[PDB]
Structure 1
Amino acid sequence: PEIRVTPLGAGQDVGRSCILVSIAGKNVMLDCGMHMGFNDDRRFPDFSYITQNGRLTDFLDCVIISHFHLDHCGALPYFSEMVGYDGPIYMTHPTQAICPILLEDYRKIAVDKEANFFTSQMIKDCMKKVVAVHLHQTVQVDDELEIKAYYAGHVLGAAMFQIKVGSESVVYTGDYNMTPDRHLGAAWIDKCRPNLLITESTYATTIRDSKRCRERDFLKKVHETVERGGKVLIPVFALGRAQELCILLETFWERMNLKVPIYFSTGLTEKANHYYKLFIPWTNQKIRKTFVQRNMFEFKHIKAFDRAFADNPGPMVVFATPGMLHAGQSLQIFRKWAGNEKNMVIMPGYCVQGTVGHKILSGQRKLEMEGRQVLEVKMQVEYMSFSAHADAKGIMQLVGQAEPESVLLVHGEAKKMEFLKQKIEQELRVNCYMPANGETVTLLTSPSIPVGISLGLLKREMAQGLLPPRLLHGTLIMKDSNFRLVSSEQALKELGLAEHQLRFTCRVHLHDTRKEQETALRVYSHLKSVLKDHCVQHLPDGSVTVESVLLQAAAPSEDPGTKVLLVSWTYQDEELGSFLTSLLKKGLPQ
């Protein structure tokens, strides 16, 4: 009953989120990623489990992928041919549609950079081995194990997955945002009481309101730029991130409107527009309602921008394509904006992509490119956490709703995670981990054994319950097929054992001068007096009873000084029976 969780790519490292999870006899990989900012050694987080069993199918029962980000699902096509995985890859329906879109686009950027990358051929091969799982739909992947999606917010298609095989549930919750950001309300998980909860720890510091704070910051930054031809250079790595940026630009225009100039994500913003409109069910409840009654996500400005913003020194609001990549449209845009006063650049996401991330962190003016290029920047660098994610307050809340036996921290940096771990340990009465890459936690649980009762038995015991001490007896029948709990008598009847009786008769010797004729009457009257609230009877044949204990005056003994009282009971009445005989040994009133 031990569930072993070892993050091969997640854990202390952010991106390449991969977490193997061995609930009972079942292994389930939780993601498989393309850590960015490295030319090699991070295309796929190295696979210990792969090196052990030649075919992955045998070792691994199942694979759930969280959503479309290159972080999580990026290296999902690695697995088409080279390490040769077959089985149900389970993503939500919005995920699987957008997943190939980002796979192929990265595929494009990689080949212009030779590299033994997955072609579109093998990406498509991998995608053909995919099953779509609707929201809150319980699907048995195996005879025993099953997996249920939840709403994770963050992006359209962010699925929080609970793998449960038996009564022990490991619920991964990766990239979940606990606020109603645009396109997404707050992520709800019901009260599962899972044994292990696995969480994103990207933000281990508590943040302000997700929407209001990010609006204030954005507006301030824009105004500050605007003084002298204020440029915008913003990286956006997702389809639904582009939409967010567009909405922010709309807000800017609404508040200000001084400069007409607006730019869009890229040439194929048509597509993003399309996809968002398509998946009305998944979007934030309110937003969907607003869409059914109002126009959504108008954009016709990208084309106008491109030509205008071709290395010219104006105000154009360009959210470029893949910012934190080796090359791209975004790199070109950054090179264009580099070294001018006009320029202000915003890091909207987490801006953690290996080397580019490090450069962002320290914001060195003398930055060195991978190639032999000298670029010196003199723009203003500001980062805002506009990226959809849960703050350390949010992590606390979801831990609350799940209320697990234990938690495991993945997908944050160790320092941040450490503090968060300490907090959670102090706050809720659980022990939480923060394991590194390639390190397993053998968190012991114990088996919880399901057996069926006889309804009669259950009813009777329930009745005993309510009037007040509640001890309950009876046997189990164990074929290893149909564990049942049945009554004493019922079990006896089932196995066909005959009705046994262990009877005692004890001879009580009375020594007094009262006449033999009066014995039974004396016994009856004394025991009726003493044994309060007991059924005590004097029967028509002269014997006396105390509940089911039988008392009978014996025939005259050959000792004139002695009168024998026979006291008899079965083993079931042994306590009362021996009590009565110890009582009577003191003799009767005289």
Structure 2
Amino acid sequence: EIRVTPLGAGQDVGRSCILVSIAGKNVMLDCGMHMGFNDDRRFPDFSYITQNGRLTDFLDCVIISHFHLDHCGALPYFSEMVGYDGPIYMTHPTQAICPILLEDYRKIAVDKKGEANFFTSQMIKDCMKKVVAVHLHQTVQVDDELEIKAYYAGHVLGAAMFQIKVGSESVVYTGDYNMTPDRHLGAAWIDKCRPNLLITESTYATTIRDSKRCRERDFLKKVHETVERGGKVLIPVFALGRAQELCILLETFWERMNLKVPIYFSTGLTEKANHYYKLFIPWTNQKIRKTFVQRNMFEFKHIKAFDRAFADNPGPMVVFATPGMLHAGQSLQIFRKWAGNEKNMVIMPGYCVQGTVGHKILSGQRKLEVLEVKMQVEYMSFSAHADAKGIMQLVGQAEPESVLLVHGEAKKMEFLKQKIEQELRVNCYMPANGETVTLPTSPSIPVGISLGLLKREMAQGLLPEAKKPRLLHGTLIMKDSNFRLVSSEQALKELGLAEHQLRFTCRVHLHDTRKEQETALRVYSHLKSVLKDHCVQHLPDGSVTVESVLLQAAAPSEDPGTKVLLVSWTYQDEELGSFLTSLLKKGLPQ
């Protein structure tokens, strides 16, 4: 059976981790932290999975989805001071990019919180030495019976859906994903594999996001308005994903509109991010991988590095800066520099965490903590998550047997549960964190078959005698290693048992005045006339044959009014023999 225990993201967001038991094997899908709890509760609870035992002994394999912090932030914590040496599977791009993000989070955690029992850089290097990398669609056997497979996702670069299949059992974990083809990230594509379970997120399940293309049309027309008014444009984005998406979008638009105004990009992570985006071309869909023949799209002709004196250099300006939530805010520094002007513009393309300075800016008051804002704001939605119709399309393509919702908010999750149960009549599950849910399976046990027996039975099925029970017969030889199905004759010659023959001879007593030779002739003619489409032949020694049933007029008995007919048959045609004896008990025509 299927056991699913989410340690995190149970009716919640962040610190996602799911423990899946399939046929007694332990697959741990994803392990990250989450902001908001400065306590150890941001890390996933380990007192259930192994209590205080051995993680490598109890758990069997680790799967990592993508390089977002709430998904790959907890690997050195899970594997280094808690202790784990088992297999960790994650893609080559995500493997290349997670340690840099981990190092940045480590430095930021030192500079903000300074937790004493915190993972160190050297054992971060040790963990990324311990991890194992997997290509797309590569069926990787963790051991003999357990294998994993990757599917392209589109949440970010390197993101991967994962299908975990043991025997015929199959659980597909989407992780985070998208259906909308990004300007540099392709849509998620899956085989119609019919999984037994579908673990999925639904971050945006109550919002039907509209036309993406018209959304960047709105963004481009307003940024064109601002640069034609000569103002300053500041875009607070986090430096991974959407940053390079907007970079490609503005590179295309600026080249086509043939403009000359300088633009700048936030430093720090730009060199590493752009290096990885250059060196991981075969993940960024067929547009960029086709354009790679002439040029390289990630090599930017108009985008340079930002300079703090270029900040107060005058003229029209467009700058991408960090971060998206403005907690530290060199972007907030330039915001405070440019807040006096009414000409300048900002676009906030992501959902801000409420109760923070980003929430103060998102709300409409002038005074934010206190400084008064004057330059114009916009709140756009360039999020790369999945929507309601996209989720319905994914489940309709995948056709799973049951689904399980994580990574979102509870009322939204319930709305999707109601809608999917009304739509596809497929069972849904809503685990809380720390809750184990159990689902029954259909473990069909394999068996062999003789090819000749298969060929003749398939020929009989192809013959136009269908819809009648043809009664597939044979026997199952069991060795506890190779269960096989064989024919009866094949089993006999294999096992050496004698082909036993059973014979019945009934003495039909016929009471009539006809002669015995004429009685046998009457038997032959009567059986030929009654049994239509039956092999009724007259053997020249005076006998009758009906298929494999032999009728012989026996020696004259002591009763002149009684004639003995020996009807002889085997067990295989003994229904026909019983019918023949019933007809002869009814008697010959006279």
Same fold (TM over 0.5): yes
**Shift of residue 31 of structure 1?**
0.6
Deviations 1:236-284 (A, max 9, x none): 3343332112234335646778882522132442332221111122221
C-alpha distance in structure 1 between counterparts of 2:402 and 2:388, whole Å: 17
Q: SS at the partner of 2:292?
A: helix
Question: 1:455–1:257: structure 2 CA closer, same or farther, 3 Å change rule?
Answer: closer
Q: SS at the partner of 1:263?
A: strand
Contact 1:363 1:381 in 2 (8 A): no
C-alpha distance in structure 2 between counterparts of 1:581 and 1:354, whole Å: 95
Q: SS at the partner of 1:78?
A: helix
Moved more, 161-170 or 440-449: 440-449
Moved more, 569-578 or 419-428: 419-428
**Shift of residue 433 of structure 1?**
2.0
Question: 1:285–1:456: structure 2 CA closer, same or farther, 3 Å change rule?
Answer: same
**Shift of residue 29 of structure 1?**
1.1
**Shift of residue 173 of structure 1?**
1.0
Contact 2:173 2:200 in 1 (8 A): yes
Deviations 1:482-531 (A, max 9, x none): 11001112122222221212211111111111112211101000000010
C-alpha distance in structure 2 between counterparts of 1:93 and 1:260, whole Å: 37
Cross-structure match for 1:370: none
**Shift of residue 380 of structure 1?**
5.1
Q: SS at the partner of 2:177?
A: coil
Contact 2:151 2:190 in 1 (8 A): yes
Contact 1:30 1:64 in 2 (8 A): yes
Deviations 1:63-91 (A, max 9, x none): 11011111211222212322111111111
Question: 1:488–1:383: structure 2 CA closer, same or farther, 3 Å change rule?
Answer: farther
Contact 2:208 2:387 in 1 (8 A): yes
Moved more, 209-218 or 456-465: 209-218
Question: 1:329–1:83: structure 2 CA closer, same or farther, 3 Å change rule?
Answer: farther
C-alpha distance in structure 2 between counterparts of 1:428 and 1:228, whole Å: 52
Q: SS at the partner of 1:209?
A: coil
**Shift of residue 378 of structure 1?**
6.0
Question: 1:276–1:363: structure 2 CA closer, same or farther, 3 Å change rule?
Answer: same
Contact 2:34 2:42 in 1 (8 A): yes
Contact 2:324 2:350 in 1 (8 A): no
Question: 1:50–1:313: structure 2 CA closer, same or farther, 3 Å change rule?
Answer: farther
Q: 2:427 aligns with which of 417, 424, 431?
A: 431
**Shift of residue 198 of structure 1?**
1.4
The alignment-based identity, stated in percent, is: 99
Question: 1:82–1:235: structure 2 CA closer, same or farther, 3 Å change rule?
Answer: farther
**Shift of residue 320 of structure 1?**
2.0
**Shift of residue 557 of structure 1?**
1.6
Deviations 1:425-481 (A, max 9, x none): 222231122322222221211211111111111111101111233320111111210
Within 5 Å, which residues of 2 pair with 1:168-179? 168-179=169-180
Cross-structure match for 1:267: 268
Deviations 1:68-125 (A, max 9, x none): 1112112222123221111111111111001111111111211111543212122112
Contact 1:38 1:354 in 2 (8 A): no
Contact 1:265 1:302 in 2 (8 A): no
Structure 1: give runs of 5+ residues left out of the alignment. Answer: 368-372
C-alpha distance in structure 1 between counterparts of 2:305 and 2:444, whole Å: 65
C-alpha distance in structure 2 between counterparts of 1:87 and 1:171, whole Å: 22
Root-mean-square deviation (CA, aligned residues, Å) is 2.8
Question: 1:522–1:224: structure 2 CA closer, same or farther, 3 Å change rule?
Answer: same
Moved more, 380-389 or 220-229: 220-229
Moved more, 334-343 or 83-92: 334-343
Question: 1:381–1:40: structure 2 CA closer, same or farther, 3 Å change rule?
Answer: farther
Q: SS at the partner of 1:50?
A: coil
Deviations 1:146-184 (A, max 9, x none): 111111123221111111111111111122221221222
Moved more, 87-96 or 468-477: 468-477
Contact 2:140 2:149 in 1 (8 A): yes
Q: 2:442 aligns with which of 441, 446, 454?
A: 446
Structure 2: give runs of 5+ residues left out of the alignment. Answer: none
C-alpha distance in structure 1 between counterparts of 2:424 and 2:500, whole Å: 56
Question: 1:110–1:552: structure 2 CA closer, same or farther, 3 Å change rule?
Answer: same
Contact 2:197 2:403 in 1 (8 A): yes
Question: 1:334–1:275: structure 2 CA closer, same or farther, 3 Å change rule?
Answer: same
Moved more, 231-240 or 307-316: 307-316
Deviations 1:523-580 (A, max 9, x none): 0000000100100111121111111111111211211211111111111111111011
Q: Which structure carries more strand by proportion?
A: 2
Cross-structure match for 2:254: 253
Question: 1:43–1:314: structure 2 CA closer, same or farther, 3 Å change rule?
Answer: farther
Contact 2:134 2:140 in 1 (8 A): yes
Question: 1:169–1:489: structure 2 CA closer, same or farther, 3 Å change rule?
Answer: same
Question: 1:357–1:183: structure 2 CA closer, same or farther, 3 Å change rule?
Answer: same
C-alpha distance in structure 1 between counterparts of 2:358 and 2:329, whole Å: 16
Q: SS at the partner of 2:573?
A: helix
**Shift of residue 61 of structure 1?**
0.6
C-alpha distance in structure 2 between counterparts of 1:23 and 1:363, whole Å: 51
**Shift of residue 227 of structure 1?**
8.6
**Shift of residue 235 of structure 1?**
3.5
C-alpha distance in structure 2 between counterparts of 1:351 and 1:233, whole Å: 16
Cross-structure match for 1:506: 506
**Shift of residue 586 of structure 1?**
1.0
C-alpha distance in structure 2 between counterparts of 1:356 and 1:530, whole Å: 99
Contact 1:80 1:123 in 2 (8 A): no
Number of equivalent positions: 584
Contact 2:202 2:406 in 1 (8 A): yes
Contact 1:80 1:122 in 2 (8 A): no
Contact 2:248 2:297 in 1 (8 A): no
Contact 1:11 1:436 in 2 (8 A): yes
Cross-structure match for 1:152: 153
Deviations 1:207-234 (A, max 9, x none): 4566403312312543566697754443
Moved more, 228-237 or 530-539: 228-237
Question: 1:376–1:486: structure 2 CA closer, same or farther, 3 Å change rule?
Answer: farther
**Shift of residue 299 of structure 1?**
4.4
Contact 1:36 1:353 in 2 (8 A): no
Q: SS at the partner of 1:309?
A: helix
TM-score with structure 1 length normalisation?
Answer: 0.91
Moved more, 434-443 or 123-132: 434-443
Contact 2:203 2:407 in 1 (8 A): yes
Moved more, 140-149 or 416-425: 416-425
TM-score with structure 2 length normalisation?
Answer: 0.91
Question: 1:78–1:366: structure 2 CA closer, same or farther, 3 Å change rule?
Answer: farther
C-alpha distance in structure 1 between counterparts of 2:354 and 2:137, whole Å: 33
Contact 1:192 1:402 in 2 (8 A): yes
**Shift of residue 383 of structure 1?**
3.0
Contact 1:305 1:316 in 2 (8 A): no
